[PDB]
């Protein structure tokens with residue numbers, strides 16, 4: 001009917017010369033095609049170029065640091081010990097900060113130079129063993145502890161203005177003692193009041209790097225001029241140095257662009273730190289309508305962002321009655337300030353800002369998550385390009401990863417951007433359409449890809465566009 | 472006599488089940504249980520519970536394989552229970568979406584992890600992986616078309632390779648745990664998510680990882696003593712995979728903390744980069760060997776399924792032919808390889824696993840309720856081993872839970888999968904349901920001529 005062949009007729013018809021040659025021809029053709037596709041894969045593999053080697057980063061290259069200068073104002077009344085600080089590390093890990101700068105805890109009386117000792121703790125903070133408990137408890141949550149070792153931290157002149165050699169001997173012993181006890185770094189402040197600054201900084205940096213290479217030394221100055229900042233960083237180049245360099249002005253955005261690009265050009269794109277002060281809040285220098293813009297800028301510039309406590313909620317020392325503005329109180333809840341009761345509202349607190357998805361704490365938490373995981377924001381290359389009158393735009397790109405575009409508006413007027421790039425590297429040229437991660441002001445929702453030619457900005461707005469590696 | 476020549480021992484069956492169960496899931500992504508569990512100890516609990524619930528289904532297929540004793544592994548069982556319609560729907564959806572996509576995806580992951588030490592964080596070239604995947608598919612198709620013993624030898628070698636690599640990872644984790652740290656396992660069950668929607672999703676992710684315990688039921692007519700060697704090999708291969716899956720995650724959690732586990736593209740590569748200084752390419756090479764071991768078992772199971780579907784009246788009878796010497800089902804293997812090479816040409820086929828998330832567990836559960844219905848209707852069949860009715864009932868509830876998750880969430884893709892599975896009904900009512908000497912003659916003459924030419928080319932007759 002239509003059934004197939006049996007074994008006998010198949011064995012008698014599939015043995016003729018003409019079918020045998022067809023079967024051997026198809027077998028040899030299949031094997032040469034297999035070898036051809038293997039050779040094509042091998043040829044394509046050795047013509048894909050390369051990718052560069054990671055740069056083997058330290059722990060302070062991977063996110064922000066957090067300065068807690070006054071300890072008893074960080075908790076409140078009574079519980080201002082080193083013991084009470086142990087209960088805050090889950091809040092600190094909510095921010096994803098990689099290090100912590102504990103303020104000076106040693107015994108200082110006043111200008112008496114021979115009585116202050118940098119090895120022995122003032123009993124108003126605790127004893128020697130709950131410091132050890134704090135170090136281990138912070139090491140479990142992946143938070144490093146930096147110790148401030150400024151000698152005369154109770155007094156107007158911060159480095160004991162009469163003698164210069166014995167206080168350098170004090171710091172030289174204290175570095176060794178606390179490195180053996182187990183701290184992960186140091187900070188010395190007000191180095192413009194220290195004579196022979198560049199010599200002692202090199203020695204202390206040497207001792208700290210000689211113990212281990214995952215140790216840090218931070219120096220702070222009140223300078224704002226680039227030539228002194230550069231003068232302290234000639235022999236030393238592994239030093240993090242915090243200064244008042246960006247706290248001058250920025251009424252116009254091209255001024256801030258000039259400051260950032262002039263610093264990075266003058267030091268040769270070395271690793272730097274970005275802050276507004278050596279010890280002060282952002283609301284000591286900026287109006288409250290610029291805090292989101294400056295927080296987007298400080299997280300997407302190539303270096304280590306450094307903040308004090310209360311910068312993530314926008315704490316203002318002049319928002320309430322009398323108080324030392326060098327050390328305001330942190331507003332955890334609405335009963336955090338007992339005096340002048342009822343003066344603290346709910347959107348001024350840590351607790352009341354964690355639920356609002358358009359608060360300042362939420363922007364800090366989103367930005368500090370993106371800073372510690374994206375490779376083009378971890379060690380990417382910075383490039384700024386020209387834009388409209390009053391803008392600051394730049395791009396961060398590493399190799400073949402997701403690229404980031406940041407556009408910021410330091411102006412009290414509406415702007416259309418008009419990204420006149422035309423000078424970028426070929427590895428980071430701009431697409432026609434890019435995504436969104438966030439904005440500082442409401443009116444947009446994120447994930448929706450926007451076209452970069454009629455890009456319009458309302459005043460005091462910053463954007464976090466994003467785009468993948470292509471050609 | 473041209474028949475299919477039963478040559479599969481106990482060790483070959485153990486290596487088939489272990490080499491299909493252990494794949495790239497234990498290597499590149501044991502992350503779902505941890506991201507929905509948010510703790511180490513609760514993750515280990517979910518892994519053990521998923522292993523127990525997969526043992527409960529493996530026992531049911533041991534009983535079904537010794538009762539019905541025909542190859543096909545759910546196709547034959549649905550034929551024996553609710554025959555005709557539903558068996559054709561299962562055969563159609565596995566011919567159309569299930570097996571070509573899974574075989575192409577396994578081949579693509581093999582090609583991606585062969586070239587990973589040359590491209591460490593680099594975004595490896597696209598066209599070089601498709602060519603290596605096509606070469607891998609064609610080589611394994613040739614090896615299974617030559618002899619059956621060659622395929623069982625390949626399965627043995629690469630199963631030994633992947634088990635030795637996982638034993639190395641486990642031993643490194645155990646020596647670092649007992650040596651001097653033991654640090655992460657002191658304050659477990661902290662931050663745990665004891666919600667229904669999280670424990671359910673963690674159990675779903677852990678129960679997808681134990682998939683593949685039904686591979687030996689596809690080749691039941693090729694086992695030596697199927698009343699002995701099938702349940703013995705299932706009962707040997709289940710606790711091995713469960714112990715390996717628990718100890719590999721213990722070794723992962725000893726060395727790595729939670730943050731870099733949850734933010735890595737492959738956990739075993741991060742493990743190798745952190746604990747092996749040099750020879751950290753051993754683990755991506757081992758991942759490639761594991762995918763090479765899985766593709767062979769997938770090819771053998773799909774070819775035997777299409778063979779049985781051709782023998783049962785569906786899927787025209789050229790696919791039922793057997794080579795006259797070297798007794799291998801050559802045109803079935805050729806058809807399977809052609810479909811996998813066709814599905815390699817589609818970019819972004821990783822979307823396509825969202826379309827048979829509902830169907831696979833639906834047909835597993837349909838075979839379990841067919842086992843229950845045959846236990847009620849025909850209680851006097853010869854059963855060489857029958858278990859209690861506890862296991863089919865609890866696995867029926869487990870499969871109802873397994874199909875309820877892609878229907879509530881991800882509900883658009885499941886209806887697309889149901890439409891794909893129902894897209895073969897014009898073939899069932901217009902060709903298969905109508906008998907012969909009533910079908911159009913010009914179709915029959917064409918199919919007969921093509922069958923005769925393929926028969927002369929492949930040197931293959933139907934079974935005697």
Ligand SMILES: *[C@@H]1O[C@H](CO)[C@@H](O[C@@H]2O[C@H](CO)[C@@H](O)[C@H](O)[C@H]2NC(C)=O)[C@H](O)[C@H]1NC(C)=O
Nearest residue numbers: 198199201202203204205206207209210235236
């Ligand atoms: C320490 O820094 C100095 C220069 O900043 C380098 O050389 C050392 O110079 C001091 C002089 O004050 C000597 O006491 C040391 O013996 C020098 N170190 C040597 C010769 O190795 C050098 O860059 C740093 N020294 C070390 C050991 O790292």
Ligand SMILES: *[C@@H]1O[C@H](CO)[C@@H](O[C@@H]2O[C@H](CO)[C@@H](O)[C@H](O)[C@H]2NC(C)=O)[C@H](O)[C@H]1NC(C)=O
Nearest residue numbers: 156157190192193221222223224225228244245
């Ligand atoms: C840094 O702080 C000091 C004190 O607040 C500023 O003033 C200097 O004070 C010392 C000691 O009184 C004098 O020796 C200097 O001559 C002072 N400098 C000036 C310019 O008056 C100092 O100006 C601050 N630095 C900056 C950049 O503001």
Ligand SMILES: *[C@@H]1O[C@H](CO)[C@@H](O[C@@H]2O[C@H](CO)[C@@H](O)[C@H](O)[C@H]2NC(C)=O)[C@H](O)[C@H]1NC(C)=O
Nearest residue numbers: 230258260261262263264265266267268269423
């Ligand atoms: C800022 O960067 C530019 C470009 O990288 C450099 O300016 C060059 O400086 C050298 C030396 O003075 C001149 O020969 C070049 O002509 C300058 N470039 C241009 C385009 O004019 C330099 O690295 C930085 N500028 C300064 C003043 O140091």
Ligand SMILES: *[C@@H]1O[C@H](CO)[C@@H](O[C@@H]2O[C@H](CO)[C@@H](O)[C@H](O)[C@H]2NC(C)=O)[C@H](O)[C@H]1NC(C)=O
Nearest residue numbers: 288313314315316319344345346347348349360
């Ligand atoms: C916290 O919320 C209150 C009320 O929403 C804010 O108070 C408003 O402040 C703006 C400008 O400061 C005024 O124009 C409104 O009239 C105020 N409304 C009320 C009801 O007082 C307050 O500014 C918020 N705090 C912060 C830091 O943003």
Ligand SMILES: NC(=[NH2+])NCCC[C@H](N)C(=O)O
Nearest residue numbers: 492494495496497680682683
């Ligand atoms: N029939 C199957 N789903 N087989 C493979 C299942 C997935 C396998 N357990 C893996 O980790 O790769």
